[PDB]
Structures are given as C-alpha cells and as structure tokens.
Design a protein around this ligand. Structure first.
Ligand SMILES: *[C@@H]1O[C@H](CO)[C@@H](O[C@@H]2O[C@H](CO)[C@@H](O[C@@H]3O[C@H](CO)[C@@H](O)[C@H](O[C@H]4O[C@H](CO)[C@@H](O)[C@H](O)[C@@H]4O)[C@@H]3O)[C@H](O)[C@H]2NC(C)=O)[C@H](O)[C@H]1NC(C)=O
Ligand SMILES: *[C@@H]1O[C@H](CO)[C@@H](O)[C@H](O)[C@H]1NC(C)=O
Ligand SMILES: *[C@@H]1O[C@H](CO)[C@@H](O)[C@H](O)[C@H]1NC(C)=O
Lengths: 114, 97, 49, 49, 48, 97, 49
C-alpha cells in the first residue's frame, strides 16, 4: 500500500535513496519487492538564501518551493537536481519577512516586482 | 586470563562461568568507536536533512534555524518565534539539561 | 567507517547547499516472507508406527 | 454420559475419518473446516523371510 | 569430557549439531540486523 | 562412574544427559525467541531514525508525546537510545473562532 | 493509482507520465524532466535491466 500503490515519502521504508516506484512479484514463500529509487551523485556546494525580500519593499518576501534560491543574480533550482532556472511565481511562495532573508535591490525577480 | 589471574568478580560470575560451563559470549559486529561514528554523523546531519523536498540535497544550516522552521511547521507563527528566540532556546535547553 | 560528505555551516545569513548534479536509478530488492510451509503430522503414527 | 450417567450416544473412533475427527476434539460437534486425520495405513499382504 | 557420557550422548542423534546450528543462525541474525540498522542510520551528507 | 557399574551407571549418566539436553533446548529456544524479538525491534529503531531523527514527524505518538520537533540518537548497551524533543502546550484558553 | 487525492478514481495514464510526476514530486523541475526524458528513461531501464 505504501510502496507500490503509492509513492512513499518515508526515508528507508521502501528502498534506499528517494522512492520513485515499486513493483511486486511473487516469491516462493512471499513477495519480492522491487523498489526503484532515485540516487543522487556528484554533489556540489552552492550558496543559498533562506528567502529573498524586496529591499525597497521589505515586507514583500519570497521563499522557494521544493527547491532553493541559489547565487549564480539569484535563481531557483529544484531540491533534487541542480539546474538553475529563473525565479518565478511558479517556484516561490510569499512569506512573512525574516532576518535571514536577503535584501535585493537590483535584479528583482517577477514575484517581487510589485 | 582475567578469570585465572584474578578469578571471578563475585558470586555467580557469568563471565568466568564461560570457561567452566562450556559456553562463550561472542563480541558484537561493530566496536564502540564505529557505533559512535554512526551516531555522531547522524547528529550532524539533523538540521540539514529534515529541511526540504527530496532526500538528495543537504542544507548546511544552523541547528537553531532548523528548530525555528520545525516550530513554524507545527503552528507557531514567525512573529512569535522572532520575538521569543531566546525564550525558545532557553526552554529547549532546560528540557535537555 | 564510511564518512558522509561534510558540508560546512556558514557564519552568515546564507547557507551551503550540497546538491546533486547527477543521478541514477537503482533497485533495492526486498523479500518479505508471508507464509511458511503448512505441515500436519500423524502423531500417533509418528510416535508408535 | 447423560446427567443420569447413561451412555446414550457414542462415536467409534476408528470407524472412519469423520469419526476420528470427533474423537480428537472429544466432541460430537466440531466446527466446519478441513482437518488432517490419521492416514489410511497400508497393511501387509504377506511376508518374506 | 567423559567418554562414557559421550557414548550415550550419541544415541540421541546429532543433538549438538542442532544446538550449534540453531545458535549460529541466531547469532548471524544479529550481525545482519546490526549491519542493516546502521546502513540506514548512516548519513549521505552531514555537517561536522 | 566412580561409584557404579555400567547397567546402573548408564541410567545415572542418562539422567544427567536428559536434564542437560533439556536445558540446552530451552536455551536455544529462548535465544531464537529473543533474537527474533530483537530483530523486530531493530526494524522499529530503523523506522524511528528515519521518521524521528532524520525528519520531523507528524505522527502523533510515534516519536515522543506532544508535538514532535526534533529527535537525537545515542547508542545504548543493547541498542539505541532515542531522545525525542516535543512541544508541550500549557495554559490553554478558550476563544471563539 | 498513485496519482491524486482519494483512493476512489483511476487515472489510466502512461507509465512514463507517472514517472515524470513522481520525479517532479521529489524535487526535479519540469524543465529538467522535459529536456531529459530520454535520459531518464534510459537510466531507469539500466536500473532494471
Ligand atoms: C533584509 O531586511 C530585513 C528588514 O530590515 C532585516 O532584518 C531586520 O534586522 C533588524 C536588525 O538588523 C531586526 O531588528 C532588531 O534586531 C535586534 C537584534 O538583536 C532584535 O533584538 C530586535 O528585537 C527587539 O525589538 C523588536 C521591535 O519590534 C521587538 O519586536 C522584539 O521583541 C525586541 O524587543 C529587532 O528584531 C529586524 O527585526 C529584522 N527584521 C525581521 C523581519 O526579522 C534583514 O536582516 C535584511 N537581510 C539581511 C541579510 O541583512
Ligand atoms: C561568527 O561566529 C562567531 C562565533 O561565536 C559569532 O560570535 C559571530 O557573531 C559570527 N559572525 C557572523 C557574521 O555570524
Ligand atoms: C553521471 O554519471 C555517469 C556515470 O558514468 C556519467 O557517465 C555521466 O556522464 C554523469 N553525468 C554528469 C552530468 O556528470
């Protein structure tokens, strides 16, 4: 029910790595599970923000959704695979301002260009 | 040898009984330093593992920052956490102390 | 002891992200026993023949 | 055995397999199911010496 | 170590083989349990 | 052996054998019960590390009591010792919502 | 089955389409999945092969 009929979000319940899909066949005294997971490699280190705020409009802040804001100025990458793309309203959420958010004053992404 | 040069520690010494009775206690699969290494590396992974989607990336963020995200995630607002960061750290410290 | 990738914390408002640039799929195989062989015994015959 | 001690009903435990079942549970009423009972023995048809 | 006893013990079949094999399997079970448990506690990435 | 001849000596040795064979069978049966139990328990420990320690849990009562925030793990003599830090509310008031 | 809310409806969609939703759901963006659909299928196939 957790593995095969659903994608699991429980680390280590199904297989190792991030669970994607599982299959089941019969075995001599039971079931044989075939768990296909996602295994990352070649990790790199990048610098990330906790969130970004409009420096001129400090109460207007965003945080990434299922990914990170990375320096490259700021761009978005999904959490499982480094692949920078523009910060847009489809990969951000508006949040309350925090002391750890960056104050950006130049190349403001579209969710902050208000 | 300890059981010969010193003998049994007390009445009913089940370690020295091994060489007498015919049974043996076997060592564990991992030594102490290896087990410590596993939980030590686990400690250092906590703040950056329980942070976002996927199990593939690691956010090397402060423990404290992790706690505030964890508290926000259960219903305590950011205004509250921001006003009370020292109060929260003190309560946490009391709980562990 | 196989050490994990060490990722440093920063003295700043930023943080280090250790993020994959590559990936693979792999299969964790698992066997779960659900049954045992069912056996009955003709106890009277077993014992006394 | 009835309250007054007389035997009014009985099972010959070697008559058939159904009878063996009743005897093994010491009851005239057993639950529905599939049960193993003593095997049907092969018997000697002669001897060799 | 008494030979008379050992001679009588033999009439009980391979008793000691069963004791040893049962415990050997039971002991392997912990090494496998431990190996699996730690493989899962193990972090991929961690801060110092 | 020192006191009895074979026809009686045999019977006496045999009593000791039966008692010792019985003891060893009981021992083994328990090592199998105890190792089966420990193995199930080990899988519970596995789940707690992944659910509790490497993640914030949303499952009431799985980790500790109260709302789970963070857990830590250290080794213990025959296993793991979990340290579950939860959020415990107090001084509830009633408001209209 | 592992597609949306509830256990009551069935989306008869391609396996491949399911995989891409599963990958998107763990943090791989759609731009990446779109550029790499053949690469992803090949890696998946290697894992099972
Ligand atoms: C991006 O811009 C934001 C917004 O300006 C900036 O975060 C702000 O930083 C200031 C300090 O630089 C915080 O102001 C104070 O900081 C001190 C530090 O000790 C606190 O003690 C103060 O708290 C007292 O006063 C508050 C006033 O209301 C009380 O509510 C509180 O209970 C205390 O009495 C106070 O926080 C300011 O709060 C933050 N802003 C936010 C939203 O947290 C941010 O740092 C800039 N980004 C970067 C990377 O620099
Ligand atoms: C750097 O770390 C020290 C450790 O005590 C801290 O006091 C100091 O404020 C930190 N500096 C920054 C920029 O965070
Ligand atoms: C990912 O790893 C495989 C392993 O052989 C390699 O062939 C491939 O080129 C790698 N891709 C990148 C982007 O490094």
């Amino acid at each position: 029910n957790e593995c095969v009929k659903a994608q699991s979000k429980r680390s280590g319940f199904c297989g190792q790595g991030t669970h994607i899909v599982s299959f089941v066949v019969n075995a001599p005294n039971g079931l044989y599970f075939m768990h296909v997971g996602y295994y990352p490699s070649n990790h790199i280190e990048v610098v990330s923000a906790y969130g970004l705020c409009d420096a001129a409009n400090p109460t207007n802040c965003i945080a990434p959704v299922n990914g990170y804001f990375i320096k490259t100025e700021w761009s978005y990458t999904g959490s499982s695979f480094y692949a920078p793309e523009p910060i847009t309203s489809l990969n951000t959420k508006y949040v309350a301002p925090q002391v750890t958010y960056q104050n950006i004053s130049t190349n403001l992404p579209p969710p902050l260009l208000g | 040898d300890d059981c010969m040069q010193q003998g049994p520690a007390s009445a009913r010494d089940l370690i020295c009984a091994q060489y007498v009775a015919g049974y043996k206690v076997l060592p564990p699969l991992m030594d102490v330093n290896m087990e410590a290494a596993y939980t030590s590396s686990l400690l250092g992974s906590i703040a950056g593992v329980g942070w976002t989607a996927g199990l593939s990336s690691f956010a090397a963020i402060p423990f404290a920052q992790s706690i505030f995200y964890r508290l926000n995630g259960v219903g305590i607002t950011q205004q509250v956490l921001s006003e009370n960061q020292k109060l929260i750290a003190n309560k946490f410290n009391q709980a562990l102390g | 002891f196989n050490h994990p990738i060490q990722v440093d914390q920063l003295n700043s408002s930023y943080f280090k992200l250790s993020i994959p640039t590559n990936f693979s799929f792999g299969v964790t195989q698992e066997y779960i026993q659900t049954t045992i062989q069912k056996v009955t015994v003709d106890c009277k015959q077993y014992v006394c023949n | 055995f009835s309250v007054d001690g007389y035997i009014r009903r009985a099972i010959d435990c070697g008559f058939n397999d159904l009878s063996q079942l009743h005897c093994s549970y010491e009851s005239f009423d057993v639950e529905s199911g599939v049960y193993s009972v003593s095997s049907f023995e092969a018997k000697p048809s002669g001897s060799v010496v | 170590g008494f030979q008379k006893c050992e001679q009588l013990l033999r009439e009980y079949g391979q008793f000691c083989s069963k004791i040893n094999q049962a415990l050997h399997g039971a002991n392997l079970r912990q090494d496998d349990s431990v190996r699996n448990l730690f493989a899962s506690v193990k972090s991929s990435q961690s801060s110092p | 052996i020192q006191r009895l001849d074979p026809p009686e000596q045999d019977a006496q040795i045999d009593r000791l054998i039966n008692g010792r064979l019985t003891t060893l069978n009981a021992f083994v049966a328990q090592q199998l019960v105890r190792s089966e139990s420990a193995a199930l328990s080990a899988q519970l420990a596995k789940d707690k590390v992944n659910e509790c320690v490497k993640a914030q849990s949303k499952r009431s009562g799985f980790c500790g009591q109260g709302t789970h925030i963070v857990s830590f793990v250290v080794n213990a003599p025959n296993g793991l010792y979990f340290m579950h830090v939860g959020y415990y509310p107090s001084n509830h008031i009633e408001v209209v919502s």
